[PDB]
Amino acid sequence: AFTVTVPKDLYVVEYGSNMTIECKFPVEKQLDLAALIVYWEMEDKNIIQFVHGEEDLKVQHSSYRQRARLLKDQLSLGNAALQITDVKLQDAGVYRCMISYGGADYKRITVKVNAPYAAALEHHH
Amino acid sequence: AFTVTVPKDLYVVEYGSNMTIECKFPVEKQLDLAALIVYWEMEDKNIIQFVHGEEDLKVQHSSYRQRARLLKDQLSLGNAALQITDVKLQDAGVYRCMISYGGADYKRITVKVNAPYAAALEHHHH
Amino acid sequence: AFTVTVPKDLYVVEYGSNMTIECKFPVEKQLDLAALIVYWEMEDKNIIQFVHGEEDLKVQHSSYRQRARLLKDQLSLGNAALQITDVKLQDAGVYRCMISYGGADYKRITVKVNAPYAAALE
Amino acid sequence: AFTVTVPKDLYVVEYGSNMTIECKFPVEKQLDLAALIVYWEMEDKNIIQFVHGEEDLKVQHSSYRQRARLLKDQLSLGNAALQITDVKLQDAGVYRCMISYGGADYKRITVKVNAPYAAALEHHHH
Amino acid sequence: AFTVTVPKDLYVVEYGSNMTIECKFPVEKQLDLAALIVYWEMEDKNIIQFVHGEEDLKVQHSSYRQRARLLKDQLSLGNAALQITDVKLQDAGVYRCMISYGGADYKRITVKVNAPYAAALEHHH
Amino acid sequence: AFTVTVPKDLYVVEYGSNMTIECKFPVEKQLDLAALIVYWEMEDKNIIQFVHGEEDLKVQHSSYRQRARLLKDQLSLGNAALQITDVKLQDAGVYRCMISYGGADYKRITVKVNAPYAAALEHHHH
Amino acid sequence: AFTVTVPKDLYVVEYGSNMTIECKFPVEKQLDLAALIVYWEMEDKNIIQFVHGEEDLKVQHSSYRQRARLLKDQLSLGNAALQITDVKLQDAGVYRCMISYGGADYKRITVKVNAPYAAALEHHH
Amino acid sequence: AFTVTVPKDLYVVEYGSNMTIECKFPVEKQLDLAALIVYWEMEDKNIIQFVHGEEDLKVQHSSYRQRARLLKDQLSLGNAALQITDVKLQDAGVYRCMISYGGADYKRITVKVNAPYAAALEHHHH
Numbered sequence A, E, G: 001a002f003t004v005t006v007p008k009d010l011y012v013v014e015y016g017s018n019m020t021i022e023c024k025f026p027v028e029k030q031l032d033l034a035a036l037i038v039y040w041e042m043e044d045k046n047i048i049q050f051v052h053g054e055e056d057l058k059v060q061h062s063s064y065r066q067r068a069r070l071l072k073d074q075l076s077l078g079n080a081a082l083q084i085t086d087v088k089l090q091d092a093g094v095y096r097c098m099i100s101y102g103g104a105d106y107k108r109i110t111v112k113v114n115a116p117y118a119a120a121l122e123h124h125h
Numbered sequence B, D, F, H: 001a002f003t004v005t006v007p008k009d010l011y012v013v014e015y016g017s018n019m020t021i022e023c024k025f026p027v028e029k030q031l032d033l034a035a036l037i038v039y040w041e042m043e044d045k046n047i048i049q050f051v052h053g054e055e056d057l058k059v060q061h062s063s064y065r066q067r068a069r070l071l072k073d074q075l076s077l078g079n080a081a082l083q084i085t086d087v088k089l090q091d092a093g094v095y096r097c098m099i100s101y102g103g104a105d106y107k108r109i110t111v112k113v114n115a116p117y118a119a120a121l122e123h124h125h126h
Numbered sequence C: 001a002f003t004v005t006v007p008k009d010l011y012v013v014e015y016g017s018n019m020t021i022e023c024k025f026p027v028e029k030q031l032d033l034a035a036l037i038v039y040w041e042m043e044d045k046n047i048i049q050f051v052h053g054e055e056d057l058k059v060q061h062s063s064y065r066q067r068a069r070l071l072k073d074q075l076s077l078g079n080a081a082l083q084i085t086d087v088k089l090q091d092a093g094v095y096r097c098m099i100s101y102g103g104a105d106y107k108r109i110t111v112k113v114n115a116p117y118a119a120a121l122e
Ligand SMILES: Cc1c(-c2ccccc2)cccc1N1C(=O)c2cc(CN[C@H](C(=O)O)[C@H](C)O)c(OCc3cccc(C#N)c3)cc2C1=O
Pocket: B037, B038, B039, B046, B049, B059, B098, B099, B100, B104, B105, B106, C001, C002, C003, C004, C037, C038, C039, C098, C099, C100, C103, C104, C105, C106, C107, C108, C109
């Protein structure tokens, strides 16, 4: 039974810092990159799409361009690691990772963002 | 006795990714920011200088301008966490973290960088 | 604004000599010897660990037994004195002094070694 | 007869510490992992599900993730030791260790957690 | 993957009547009694301890002697069926079946009992 | 008569695995952390020095940092257990555990490491 | 912090002479002999087990019987001084002194043995 | 009702190999060395005589010099294991293990030794 698991389903990240959130999927024997699909989204905004060889920036929401990378070396180990760079308050919420590799599954991760008064103030209006 | 520890003295980072390397120092009860000095460098190039309550960028090497920050929320938990954004091959090397909090200590961490042939090529020629 | 100062950035010594390299930190009025830490290092082999009251050889490297000693009463000067007796050719390299006294700082000191042909055979 | 024995059926742990609780089971000569099953439970919440050779974590209750661990090294010594890091007041209660190794058996252990007023106030709010 | 199944997670019986809870486990073709262990308990009260062929009854709780049986006829059908005679009010609660047959797994069956006023008052006092 | 016991004076471990070796000493009712000293060494290279309540981290030999820890949880039970993670070929030899707890005693444990050819070649040449 | 020190971690004695190796332990006030444990050994061979104010010679190795002494006078000054009489070539090697006095620590002392050709010849054969 | 039990009443070993033959006896909770007696023999040739603390080999047959040892490590486990190193053809025959521990009992174990033509030839001629 193909099951994606998450070591953490909650992350607490500092405003402006970098973030790595992980989804584990089973990789027995060598990895077949052609049969792997990884989809990373947050509340209906597409962050990352990995079909066949490389990502696809066709659906990547503008709030994530140049800011989101999928750690490719980690796929061989069974790790779909999403990195977001320079975390902002609008990065708090529910992330979903969909993984297709033989079987198909997905998991949910919650990111809370702590921010100082100045940043919160700019985000308030 | 004051000793900085490292949960990992070796990091293998993929070219172009973000990196977080940690140094632990003992904090009991609530952290005293006024007594805390945190210093990160690599091969005699200063990355971070955290004195009193804020980073000091007077000595920061040009390869770390807006590329390196210390996670301050982790300081309360006794964790001096250095974050390097967009790791390049020039970032592979030996990092030293100097912590002063009552006592004083430092530790070493090795960072290796794996890279595709394109990036390795541009670094090799330049 | 705590800062460590080095009088000479480079020391040139001949083989079998006695080299005294030295960093100096701002000591004002009485020296609170309890709040002083002095590391002396050379390319990640540590030479001195002056913590609290006296030295600590529990981490000292093999290349400095009985050879190196930090002049102690020198610390009322602010003097954090390292002297290598019977200087060897492998003592040439980059030295570092860490000083923690209120603030903290460290400085580098390049040390080159001249030797005759008899010793150079490693 | 196959029989699990517990040297302590009661542990008094301090909030925030680590506890390792033991379940002894008879192992003759060298252990055979394929025949060994270890369930660790607490009021019908699964902590550990150790079948074949490694754990099973899609059964693991949420309040125990990255906190609980079966000490594998000591299984060959007839000990099924569970370690809970950073004990919280929710960790109080009756733990069960089910062990299948040819025979089958299970024993109960009681954990009581002491906490200062501050932490007990935090837990009391939730 | 050995896993105990349950047809009815819930049983609703009436006081004085008789109860038949069943925990199914996978058997195929011949049943090897010399490798079968069934354990029925309810809230740390042991009911039956079926170990290698026959139940041990110095293990049985006092409130279950002469009233609880396992159907050794039904074990060949992949069925650990516990039956309670004259269901009193103290027979309500969560039951557990532990089963070791090659693998090992357990499951829980909750039981609610209905009683008239008289029996309810005898239980209350 | 204060006696340290070792349930195994010989371990045969596989290169790359984890190893936990046990020393037992008598603790009747509560443990007196203030009166407990625990040394772990392996052929004149110190591994653990547990004095008062915490490990001493500068006595420790370089080849064992990041890889050796004393499992404090089990001290209450009278078990000075040493875990070495990611066992190396150099970890083979005679371990000694010294214990002071009222009385004092020490015992010896022989560790042998099996390894496949690749690791044995690395250790043979370096 | 209890700590045993050694004035000399190396002795070079002479085959046939008398040897005295010392281990310093910090003694405050007058010596409380009830809490002092001195354990001199050499390559897993017990030499002196000074406990409770006396020497314990039963586990003492045969080769050190009536040749090994502990200068009790030095104990009051903070000195554990093991003396060996008539040094043979077997006495070369590493000695360990273990001292428990409030705290506990141990030190190592290396003994080298010079010897004429006759002694070396009988030892070699 | 004291009773010695043999897991294997028959052993088939190779020449020059090592063999261990076991005899189980009930050790309840903890072993009393002062009330334990273990005889091992083969064809009325005395092999091991374990009385009180450890073996005393006065009546040791001259054919079991250097050969046999009693696994004491296993005595506290209710196991009297005779270990014979360097199995020779002289060792085939019936072994008896005789245990006194409260009660007493003995058991018989047959040992057959396989051997190549060379060793069988030297045994046949002498
Ligand atoms: C030594 C130390 C310790 C420490 C102290 C004792 C023992 C072990 C560790 C603990 C925490 C922080 C630091 N800890 C500092 O607190 C610090 C501060 C500065 C800035 N010092 C200024 C300066 O003068 O540059 C001064 C304000 O004036 C450093 O800069 C190193 C540097 C920079 C440029 C050239 C050279 C050389 N050669 C060396 C290096 C360091 C540094 O490790």
